[PDB]
Write a protein that binds this ligand. Structure first.
Ligand SMILES: Nc1nc2c(ncn2[C@@H]2O[C@H](COP(=O)(O)OP(=O)(O)O)[C@@H](O)[C@H]2O)c(=O)[nH]1
Ligand SMILES: [Mg+2]
Length: 168
């Protein structure tokens, strides 16, 4: 079965793990397991054909992570996540995008900008500012809530579409 490797990056605390687990848990009966894995698989249908997503969550750059760059280089597409009530995590998006280009040795890498925690009323990053940043990068932008499930499936599906566009 075809397998696409998706890597989730961004500052710690923005909801990288919550988004990933919410995607995996949606639409299925999951074993109760309190383990937090750093990677999860999910079956999807791409152009009528069942495929596997392998989704890996990475540590924010404020944490040392010996394998982080090697892990990222295996990624075919990246979810760059910030929290809408965390201005620094949005400012950090530039770092993550440049670090993705570094580890992939490429100027053209599939990515999606994700503004998470959109259930919160304490936003400090205007939706327009993130929309305009994504457009300037040529990438999609979506606001999500791992809490309410708003946009969660759609964020990962949009990334899969970006990967497919790149492959073609
Ligand atoms: N309100 C709200 N809290 C969230 C959301 N996503 C994550 N959180 C919380 O933010 C904290 C960090 O989430 P986590 O997924 O562990 O962050 P990570 O370090 O980016 O993986 C936890 O307390 C989560 O429950 C969201 O969409 N809304
Ligand atoms: Mg955390």
């Amino acid at each position: 079965m075809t397998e696409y490797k998706l890597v989730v990056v961004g500052a710690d605390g923005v909801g990288k793990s919550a988004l990933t687990i919410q995607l995996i848990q949606n639409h299925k009966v999951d074993e109760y397991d309190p383990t937090i894995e750093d990677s999860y698989r999910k079956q999807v249908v791409i152009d009528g054909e069942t495929c596997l997503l392998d989704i890996l969550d990475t540590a924010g750059q404020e944490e040392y992570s010996a394998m982080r760059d090697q892990y990222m280089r295996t990624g075919e597409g990246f979810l760059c996540v910030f929290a809408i009530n965390n201005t620094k995590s949005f400012e950090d998006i530039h770092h993550y995008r440049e670090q993705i280009k570094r580890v992939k040795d490429s100027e053209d890498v599939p990515m999606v900008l994700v503004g998470n925690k959109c259930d919160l009323p304490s936003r400090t990053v205007d939706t327009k500012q993130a929309q305009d940043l994504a457009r300037s990068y040529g990438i999609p932008f979506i606001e999500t809530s791992a809490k309410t499930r708003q946009g969660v499936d759609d964020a990962f599906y949009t990334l899969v579409r970006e990967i497919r566009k790149h492959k073609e």
